[PDB]
Amino acid sequence: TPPQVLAIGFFLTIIIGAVLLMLPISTTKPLSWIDALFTAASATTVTGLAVVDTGTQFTVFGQTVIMGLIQIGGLGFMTFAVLIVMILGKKIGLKERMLVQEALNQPTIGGVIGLVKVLFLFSISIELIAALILSIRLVPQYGWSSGLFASLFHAISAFNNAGFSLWPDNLMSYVGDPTVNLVITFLFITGGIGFTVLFDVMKNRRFKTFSLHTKLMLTGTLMLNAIAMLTVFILEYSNPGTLGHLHIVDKLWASYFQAVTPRTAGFNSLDFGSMREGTIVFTLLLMFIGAGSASTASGIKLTTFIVILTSVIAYLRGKKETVIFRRSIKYPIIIKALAVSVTSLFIVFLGIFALTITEQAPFLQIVFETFSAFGTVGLTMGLTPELTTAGKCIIIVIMFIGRIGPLTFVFSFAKTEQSNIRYPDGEVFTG
Amino acid sequence: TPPQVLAIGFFLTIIIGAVLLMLPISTTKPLSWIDALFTAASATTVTGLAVVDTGTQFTVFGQTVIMGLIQIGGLGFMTFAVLIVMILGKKIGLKERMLVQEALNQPTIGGVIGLVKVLFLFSISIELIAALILSIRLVPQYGWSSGLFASLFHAISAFNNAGFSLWPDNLMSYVGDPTVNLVITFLFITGGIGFTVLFDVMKNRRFKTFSLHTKLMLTGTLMLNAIAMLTVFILEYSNPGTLGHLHIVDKLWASYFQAVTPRTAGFNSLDFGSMREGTIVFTLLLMFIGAGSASTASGIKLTTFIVILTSVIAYLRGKKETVIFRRSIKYPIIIKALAVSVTSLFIVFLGIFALTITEQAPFLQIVFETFSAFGTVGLTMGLTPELTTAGKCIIIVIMFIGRIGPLTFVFSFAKTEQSNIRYPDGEVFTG
Amino acid sequence: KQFAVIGLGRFGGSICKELHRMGHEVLAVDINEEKVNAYASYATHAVIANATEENELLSLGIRNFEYVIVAIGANIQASTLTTLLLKELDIPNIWVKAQNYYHHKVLEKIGADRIIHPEKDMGVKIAQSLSDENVLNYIDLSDEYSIVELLATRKLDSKSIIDLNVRAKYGCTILAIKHHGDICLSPAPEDIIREQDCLVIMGHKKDIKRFENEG
Amino acid sequence: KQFAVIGLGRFGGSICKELHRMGHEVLAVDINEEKVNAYASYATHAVIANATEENELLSLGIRNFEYVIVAIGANIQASTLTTLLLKELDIPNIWVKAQNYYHHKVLEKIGADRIIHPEKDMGVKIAQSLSDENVLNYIDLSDEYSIVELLATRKLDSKSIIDLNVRAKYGCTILAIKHHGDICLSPAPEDIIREQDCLVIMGHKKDIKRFENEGM
Amino acid sequence: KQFAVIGLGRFGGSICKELHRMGHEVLAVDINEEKVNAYASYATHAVIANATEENELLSLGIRNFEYVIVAIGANIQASTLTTLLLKELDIPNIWVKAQNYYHHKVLEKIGADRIIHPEKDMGVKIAQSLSDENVLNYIDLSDEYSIVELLATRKLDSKSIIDLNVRAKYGCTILAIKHHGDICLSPAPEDIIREQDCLVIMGHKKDIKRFENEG
Ligand SMILES: Nc1ncnc2c1ncn2[C@@H]1O[C@H](COP(=O)(O)OP(=O)(O)OP(=O)(O)O)[C@@H](O)[C@H]1O
Ligand SMILES: Nc1ncnc2c1ncn2[C@@H]1O[C@H](COP(=O)(O)OP(=O)(O)OP(=O)(O)O)[C@@H](O)[C@H]1O
Ligand SMILES: Nc1ncnc2c1ncn2[C@@H]1O[C@H](COP(=O)(O)OP(=O)(O)OP(=O)(O)O)[C@@H](O)[C@H]1O
Ligand SMILES: [K+]
Ligand SMILES: [K+]
Ligand code: NA
Ligand code: NA
C-alpha cells in the first residue's frame, strides 16, 4: 500500500498538470491532448523530452506550471506532502512516516522525517544561489524581465535533472561559456549525487567517517565522469559535425559537459544526431546508469551498477563474498540490485520492441529514445518531434515507470506471497 | 587448470584447421589468411558465419575438413579426447575425469565418463539415420556423388547447430518442403536440448521421474518455440519481402522454421535482411538465449534464463526462495546464472562498441551480428561479407568466447582467491 | 497517540492486538522472527530488532512515540537495558512488565513511569475467587472498600431488594443486577432476585463478607 | 484419492513409499529439511512445513485431501495441535499415530477418526511368536477365533490330511499349505504334509493351542 | 607506526578506541562477527578472522605491522598459538594479555616481548585504595619509593606547607596540590592546605604511611 500511494499520487500530478497546460492562458498556440499529456508527463517524471518547444508554445504562466511540475516531480510527491502536513500543524504519524521510507528508498524509518527537512531546505537554497550566479550572465543578454526568469527556470531545471530549456537550442549557444557550464554541471551533479550523500557530507567533513554508500557515490561518480570525458573527447575529436570546428579550450568544455549530462540531466552542447555511432553506444550504457538512490535522477543507480559488477568479479576471482571498501555486502542487497537491473532491461526491451512496431525510424534512434525515456534523461537524436500518437503513449508509460522505479511500479499491483513453507533443493545446470 | 586445458585445446583446433583450409588442395580459389582463420573459427565454434561460400570456395576435401571441425567443435574437445585414450587402452585417471566435468558443466564427477560414451554413440547414430532420411530427397536432385555428400554434410551441420550449407542459398529453396524442414529441425532441437536431457529420456520413459533440469528443458523449449512461432507469423504476415508471397501452408513452415533456428542452428528459410525491425528485436532476445547446458548450442542457456526470471518474479511477489516445479533453487545456482548473464552482456556490449568504431554499417546489422556471433548462431543481415580485416578479428574473438562460455574463458586467466577471512556488513542503497 | 510495544509475548501480543483493534498506530518490536511475522497483520508496523542496542533503537524512530511498552518479563538484563536507553532518549511514558520483587526495584531506580505485574495481579484476583465461589469479579476502590460482582444463591431466589437489609444492617449498596442477560443500572425498591445471576454490590470489604455468609 | 502424510519417520515414510508405489498422489509434510529431501522422490509433493501452524497448513492446500495421516508419535504437543487444526478444517479422515495410553485418550477427545499404535501392535504380534515358535503369522478374527499360519514339525512329516482329526477332535479347519513355494488353496483329502512349511489353520484360539501341543 | 589488535574484548576494544583517537592505523581482528561490526567505526580496518590459522593471518598483511597486540586472556590455546605464528612471522613487537601465572610462563617460553595482566594489576591498585582510603592513585617508582596522590583530611585544613615537617621528619617531598580544580606544580613555602583535595607526595613507601597516620 505505501507503493500504491506513490503510484496513485504521482499519476494524479500528470492529470492535474495536463489540464493546466491545456488551458488557453498557459499556451500561445493550440495544443493537442497528447502533447499536453506528454509535456506534463515529461515534467513530473523530470525527463525533458519535448514534442513542442517550451519557449514558444507556452506563455510565462505556462512555463511557471512547468517549474511547479519539475519541482514537485524532482523532489518527489511525498517530499512536499510532509511539508504541507507540518505547516498545517498536524503531527507525522507512523503510517505517514512509512510512506517517506518507501519514497526515499530508505531501509529504516530512523531519522527520515528530518531528512526531508534538510533536503527541501537545501534544494530551495542552492536553486536560489545558482539563480543569482546565472543572473550575472542572463540579465545583460535578455534584460531584467526575461533574464531573471531564464536563470530561475534553468536553476530549477538543472538541479532537478530535467534538461528543459526555454531557448530553441538547448544550451548549444553556450559551448565555450564557463559561467553556464560550471554552474549548471554543479547543479545536476550535486542534485543527482543523492540526498543521503549530501546529508552525510554536511554533517561529516572527513572522508574516513563517510558511510559505504557515500564513499561509493563520491568515488564512483568521479571515476565514471573521467572515463566518459576521455571516451567522448577521443571519439569525437575528428568528427566534423560535433567537436571538430572548435578550439581546444572549447573541446574540453563540450567533452566535459557531454560526459556528465546523460546522468541524468539531458542538457547538451553538441548535436547528438550528428555524433558517431561509437559515442552513442557508450552513452546508452552511460544513461542506463543513473546517480544516487534518493536523488532527482532515475534509471538503475550507480550503487546498483557497482554492487552487481563487484559481485560478478568476486565470483570470477573465486571470492565467497562481495567486498567494497573493506565492507561485506549481504545477500538482500545483492538480490535487490539483481531485481532492479533485470526488470529495467525487460521494460526497456519492451519499449524498443513496441516502438519498432509503431514508429518508422532508424533503429539507433529508437534505442536511444527508449534508454533516454526510461532513465529520464531527455537526450534526443531527432525522434521525439517525429513520434506518432501511439508512439508518444508508449514513451509516457516508459517515463512513468522509469521515474517511479521498476520495483515500486510492480509492487503496486503485485500481491505479497507470505508463506513459511519450504521445498527440497533441485539441481539445475545454469552453465 | 581444467579451464586452462579447455582454452588451449579449443584454440589449437582453430590453428590446425586454418592451415588445412589454406592448402591449395582444400580450396578452388586463393584464400586470405584471415578468411581461412575466420572459416576455421566459425566451424570449431560451430557458428556458421561465412565470409566465403562453402560450396564454391572449398573442394570436396576442404568441406571434409569443415565436417571434422564441426564434429570436433560441436561435441567438444574433451569428448573425443576420452575416446582416443579409451581406444588406445589407457584407463581414465582422476585428473582426466575432472577435465570432463569442467567440459560438460557437470557439478559432480559421478558417472561422467559413461555420459561421453552415450552422447558420442547417440551422435553418430542419429547423424547416420538423418543422412539416410535426407538421402531419399537429396539424391534425385544432385545425383549419387553429390546427393550423398550433401545429406551427410547437412546432417552433421544441423545436429551440431552449425548452419553451414553447401548451396549458395542457405535452405531458402526448401521453404515449403516438409522433408527438409522436419528432419533438420528435429536435429538441432534434439542436438541442442542437452546431452544430460537426452540421457534422462533414454533411461526414464515417464515425465514424473525426470529431473528438474530435464523438466525445465522440455517445458521451456516447447513454450519458447510456441511464443516465437506466433511472434514471427503475426509480425511477418503482411511483409512483402518475407512470408508475403507464400501460401498459408508455406507460411506455417517458414514461421515454424524461423522460430526454432536462432537457438542456435542459424539455418534460414526467409531473408533476415528484409524482415521488419520488430521481428529482429525479438530474434535478438531469442538468440541471446541458447539451449541446453551440455549440448551443441552456446550463449546463455534456457535454464539460465528461467532461473534468473523466476528469481526476480519470486522477489517481486515477496517470496523468500526460488521455486520451480515445486523444487527450491539454492543460492550457488542463482549466483552462477547471475555471473553468466552479466558477463555475456558485457562481452556483447564490448563487441557492439568495438564494431561501431571499426565497421561502417547500419546499427541494427551490427547488433544482430554481435548477438549471432556470441550465441554461435550464424544468422546474418548482410554484414559478414562486408566486414573489414579488423572487423573480422573482433568476430573471431566473440565466437571463441561464446562457444567456450564466458565463465570458462575468464577462469583461464583469473587466479583463485582463497581467503577464509570475512568483513563487517556495510549498508548500501541499491534502489 | 503513537504506541510502541517491545516484546511480542502473551502479554505484549495482547496489547498490540487490542490497540490495533481500537484504531491506534502500534509499533511491534521483537527479537524473534516468528513472533514478528505472526503479529505483522496485527500491528501498524512490525520490525525485527534488538531493543538493547541503541543503534537499532534509533533506526525505528522510537523518539516519535509517546508511550513505549517494554513487555519483557523473563529477561531482566534485556528489560532493564531497554528502559535505560528509552529513559536516556527522553521517552515521556515508559511502561515495563516486571518479573519479581527485585526486578521491580531495579526498574524503579532507572526511571520506570509504570511497572506492571500481569501474572501477579491475576493470581491474587483468581485466588479471591478460589477462596469464595460466590464472587465473580471485584475491583478494589481502596484497601477497605471494593465493588464485588456476586453470584446469587438459592436462598436469595424470589427475594425483593427491600427484603434484603443490606443498606441498614450490612451497610452495603446494591449496584446492578444482570437478569439473565438483562442489566438494570441502580435498581429501585423493589426488584425480585432470581436464580444464579450476577449481583453487583458495593460496601466495606469486611461488610460484604458478612452478607455472603449470612444473607 | 489424495493422501497427505504429516511427519516422515519410520512409520510415516513407509506410508509415503507404499502409497506412491501403488500410484497415489501423496503429499509429504515434515519439519526436517533432510527428511523432505530424502522422500522428495518417493512422494508426489514434498514440502518443508510446520503442521502446528494454521497459516502454513493452509498454504499446502490441505483442505483438498480426503485422508490426512499425522504420523507423529514422539511429540504429543505437535501431534495433538496438528489434528486440532485438521478437525477445525473439516478433514473427512484423520489417522493419527499415538505414543501411549494417555496420548490415545487426548486424540479421541479432539476428534481422531482412527488412532494407530504401530509399535504396540507389532510388539504383541512378535511376543506371540516368541512364546510359541510354531506360529509364524496370525490374524485375530475375534477375541476367541483366529487364523494362524503354523509351521510343520517333524511328527507331521509324511502325514495325510485325513490322518489329522482337526475337524472332529480339535474342531479346526486346515486352510492352506505352502509346499516349498507351492501354495494350495483349500486342500482336499488327502494331502501329504511335508517338512517345515507354512500350514494355515483356522479355529478357536484355545483349540489351535491344543493342536500345537498334541497334534504338532 | 601500524598497530594490530587481535581480540576485541574489554581490554582489546579499549586499545583500538584509544589508538584510533590519537590518530593511528589500527587493524582490529576478532573471530566474533558482532565484535567486528561494533568496532568497525573505531578502527582503520576491521576483519573477521581466526588468528590461530596461518593462512588467515597472512591474508591480513600482518607482516607489515610493527606492534601486534594479542588481547586474548580467557583462551590459553588461542592465545599461545597466535603468538607462535607471529613469532614465526618475525613480528618485532608482540604484546600478549595473559590469564594466570601458568599462562605467563608459556608465553615467556614461546617469545613474548611483553606480557600484560590488566585485571591483576588493577586488583592490586584497587586493594591499596581499599586498605587506605587516604590514597587515590599511586605509581611505584621502585619497590621502596612511590608517588602517592593523597587526599587532604580535616586536620590538614588551613595548614601551611612550612607547618608540615614532611621534608625533615618524614623525609617526603610535596609535589602538587589540586586546589579545587586548580593545579600548582612544585608549590613554594608556604601554601595553605584546603579541604579534601588531591595532595601529591613523593617519598619512601614506609615514610608516606607514617605521614598518613601521624600528619
Ligand atoms: N532484547 C529483546 N528485544 C526485543 N524483543 C525481545 C528481546 N528479548 C526478548 N524479546 C521477546 O520478547 C517477548 C517476551 O519475552 P519473554 O518470552 O522472555 O517474556 P515473558 O515474561 O515470558 O512473556 P509473556 O509472559 O508476555 O509471554 C518474546 O517474544 C521474546 O522473543
Ligand atoms: N510439527 C511438526 N510438523 C511436521 N512434522 C513434524 C513436526 N514435528 C515433528 N515432525 C516430524 O515428524 C516425524 C516423526 O516424528 P517423530 O520422529 O518425533 O516420531 P516417532 O514416533 O519417533 O516416529 P517413527 O517411529 O515413525 O520414527 C519426524 O521426521 C519429525 O521431524
Ligand atoms: N582465535 C581467536 N582469534 C581471534 N579472536 C579471538 C580468538 N579467540 C577469541 N577471540 C576473541 O578475543 C576477544 C577476547 O577474548 P576473551 O573474551 O576469551 O578473553 P577475556 O580475557 O575474557 O577478555 P577481556 O579483554 O574482555 O578481559 C573476544 O572478543 C573473543 O571473541
Ligand atoms: K532529465
Ligand atoms: K550455428
Ligand atoms: Na518408533
Ligand atoms: Na576480563
Author numbering:
A (entry chain L), B (entry chain K): 15 to 445
C (entry chain B), E (entry chain D): 7 to 221
D (entry chain H): 7 to 222
Sentences reproduced from the published study:
The K+ uptake system KtrAB is essential for bacterial survival in low K+ environments. The activity of KtrAB is regulated by nucleotides and Na+. The KtrAB system is composed of the transmembrane KtrB dimer, each containing four structurally similar domains (D1~D4) arranged around a four-fold pseudosymmetry axis normal to the cell membrane, and the regulatory KtrA octamer (tetramer of homodimer) with a ring-like structure, known as the RCK gating ring. ATP binding to KtrA octamer activates K+ flux activity of KtrB, whereas ADP binding inactivates it.
